[PDB]
Amino acid sequence: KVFGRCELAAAMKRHGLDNYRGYSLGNWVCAAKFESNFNTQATNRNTDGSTDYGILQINSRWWCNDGRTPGSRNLCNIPCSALLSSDITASVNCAKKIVSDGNGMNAWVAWRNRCKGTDVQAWIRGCRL
């Protein structure tokens, strides 16, 4: 399901991502905007061979099991097929973990190269929350 912008912003807010670990809603929206275009059915095979999964783009090397990435850890304890569902509960329950590894949101390169240091509250501008 392709989530709108303010549409998504609301799904996160209630799932508990608005100020999780100290990162506002704006950072989260930006993350998936550049990592999937709000598309939750989005996947992308990485060079290392692992694949990214979800509207937050989460690889199977360190966070989920896809049944084809050798050296998997699956620290989230999931299948990566679950980060494709329209319901972003599992892609949120896992994002928290990743942002609590000690790297913060630096985990997402897209955020370190496109959202970090910019006006990110503009991503929730005009949304009724």
Query: Which residues are designated catalytic?
Result: 35, 52
- Number of Cβ atoms within 10 Å of the Cβ of 11: 16
CA 41 to chain centre: 12
**55 and 39 Cβ atoms separated by less than 8 Å:** yes
CA distances from 86 to 11, 39, 113 (A): 11, 9, 27
Q: Are 10 and 29 in contact (CB under 8 A)?
A: no
Flag whether 101 is marked binding: yes
- Binding residues are 101
- Binding residues for substrate are 101
